[PDB]
Design a protein around this ligand. Structure first.
Ligand SMILES: [Fe+2]
Ligand SMILES: [Fe+2]
Ligand SMILES: [Fe+2]
Ligand SMILES: [Fe+2]
Lengths: 213, 213
């Protein structure tokens, strides 16, 4: 669809790091649908601008300043999602994708009127909206994969927002604000939610943050 | 703010032609805040792509195919205005400006959900939203400057949407759907609207289309 930007790279690297601890060229390539050589050129570029750094062979993350630049973009991205979701009913599982076109043009005027009109400080998937400088409130949540059987918690945010992921979460009502109880962690993470028992596979579970009671 | 695009040129040339019959380099330069040499280069480019044509010395308009390409962009522009105006209350007089950032990313998904959610076929300033191919319903309106004293009419659309213009119209309630009566045309166009008498200066009046009864 649209031509890929620096901001799109920042966004996916930040997600991947939250999700699995690192970003690889191949993961970025596949997520952005950009050939690996271009991804390599952009990663080197981000590194020479002190926006990103190599963790070890083939693994990268954002620097602190890169992470705050990501956050300044995510303020636009997340508010676009709110706009699209609350105004016109773009489905919860589609709104991350549909926000792509309009997000670069979100001005502070639009962002702040949106925030105040709908009275929100999180995107539909529970992530906080960073302030204009790229800061975010520290939040007290943890990985759902860290909890033991019989722990109870509340879904906080979905840190990695893909298609397979959002769809599964939507289908099973595993959304921000939902109370859950851990039934099992063997092989999958099985939870009690809305009276139903749902097995969450590891690749999906890794994206789920929760707040314990 | 944002870097100027081909679409911005199409938009202003189309407006200027509706407004005064032609676009000059100097009018485009001032409207887009782009130096005259760059405007000259872009106009020549539009001409060599058969998107625009020279009327006479120093005066240009869009070709029919250029006008339909303009319309395809204006579908995005106008729906962005509706989104911004109806969702978050961006003021009627500001919404043309604020739409600038987000309009290029309006997808058909967003556009059509917006159109159907708010049930509109015109932008807040009364212009029709063209279809995806760049066609517009022919409309039966005329220039308010064409009417004689004692004619009655209804404001149809504001074809040229600047700051000085929209503000004056807003301030005086001269908006799409308002019934008016021509009192005078000497020097200004003076109308009866909402029980008040309002002189409309020529430079503003030229932007106003109406439908007669
Ligand atoms: Fe998102
Ligand atoms: Fe989100
Ligand atoms: Fe407009
Ligand atoms: Fe408009």
């Amino acid at each position: 669809i649209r031509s890929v930007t620096e901001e799109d790279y920042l966004k996916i690297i930040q997600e991947l790091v939250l999700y699995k601890g690192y970003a690889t060229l191949a993961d970025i390539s596949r997520s952005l649908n950009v050939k690996r050589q271009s991804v390599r050129d952009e990663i080197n570029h981000l590194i020479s601008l002190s926006m990103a750094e190599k963790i070890e062979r083939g693994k990268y993350r954002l620097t602190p300043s890169g992470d705050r630049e990501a956050n300044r973009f995510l303020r636009k991205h997340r508010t676009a999602e709110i706009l699209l979701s609350r105004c016109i009913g773009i489905p919860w599982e589609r709104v991350d994708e549909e926000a792509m076109g309009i997000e670069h043009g979100m001005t502070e005027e639009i962002i702040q009127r949106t925030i105040e009109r709908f009275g929100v400080d999180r995107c539909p998937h529970g992530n906080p909206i960073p302030d204009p400088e790229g800061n975010v409130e520290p939040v007290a949540d943890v990985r759902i994969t860290s909890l033991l059987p019989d722990s109870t918690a509340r879904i906080s945010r979905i840190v990695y927002e893909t298609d397979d992921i959002l769809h599964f979460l939507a289908l099973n009502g595993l959304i921000p604000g939902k109370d859950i109880k851990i039934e099992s962690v063997k092989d999958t993470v099985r939870v009690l939610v809305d009276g139903r028992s749902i097995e969450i596979p590891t690749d999906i579970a890794m994206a789920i943050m929760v707040t314990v009671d």
